[PDB]
Amino acid sequence: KLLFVCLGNICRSPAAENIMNAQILGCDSAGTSSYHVGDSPDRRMTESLKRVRARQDFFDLAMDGDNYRNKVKCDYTEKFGEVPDYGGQAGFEHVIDLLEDACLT
């Protein structure tokens, strides 16, 4: 069982969970903050080409350094030189770009 973790579990780790599901030989996601528990993934992140409920476990992968530190593991990124978090749509595609590289299997 693989668990992908970001801060609110509405943008990054929900994307990681679906990318990994598609790449997989067959995931879940959650968040360090429970402020968004029960919400659907961010409307902008579901919108794309590119199929994406927030919940707040120690499973058999952190999106940024704050999620990770400061079984636990961008260090599977092989092509693109964190998975970045108040932005326009281009930042959402970059998140997907990084997860298609990193998504490890």
Q: Can you tell me the distance from the alpha carbon of 68 to that of 40, in angstroms, rounded to the nearest whole number?
A: 23
Q: Can you tell me the distance from the alpha carbon of 68 to that of 44, in angstroms, rounded to the nearest whole number?
A: 25
CB-based contacts of 21: which residues, under 8 Å, 6+ apart? Answer: 27
Q: How many C-beta atoms lie closer than 10 Å to residue 60's C-beta?
A: 5
Domain count within the chain: 1
With tokens 């996601």, the residue in question is 29
Q: Name 6's bridge partners.
A: 31
Residues across the chain = 105
CB-based contacts of 67: which residues, under 8 Å, 6+ apart? Answer: 5, 6, 7, 32
Task: Fill in the amino acid letter for 97.
Answer: D
Look up residue 57 and give its two tokens: 């476990």
Look up residue 56 and give its two tokens: 């707040």
Q: State the resolution, in angstroms.
A: 2.3
Alpha helices in 47-88 (DSSP H): 65-68
Q: How many C-beta atoms lie closer than 10 Å to residue 103's C-beta?
A: 23
Q: Name 28's bridge partners.
A: 3
Asked whether the beta carbons of 82 and 66 are under 8 A apart, the reply is no
Handedness of CA 67, 5, 96, 90 (dihedral sign): negative
Asked whether the beta carbons of 31 and 55 are under 8 A apart, the reply is yes
End-to-end CA, the chain? 12
> Which residues are identified as catalytic?
6, 12, 85
Q: Can you tell me the distance from the alpha carbon of 50 to that of 27, in angstroms, rounded to the nearest whole number?
A: 19
Domain boundaries, position 47:
1-105
Asked whether the beta carbons of 83 and 60 are under 8 A apart, the reply is no
* DSSP 3-state of 3: strand
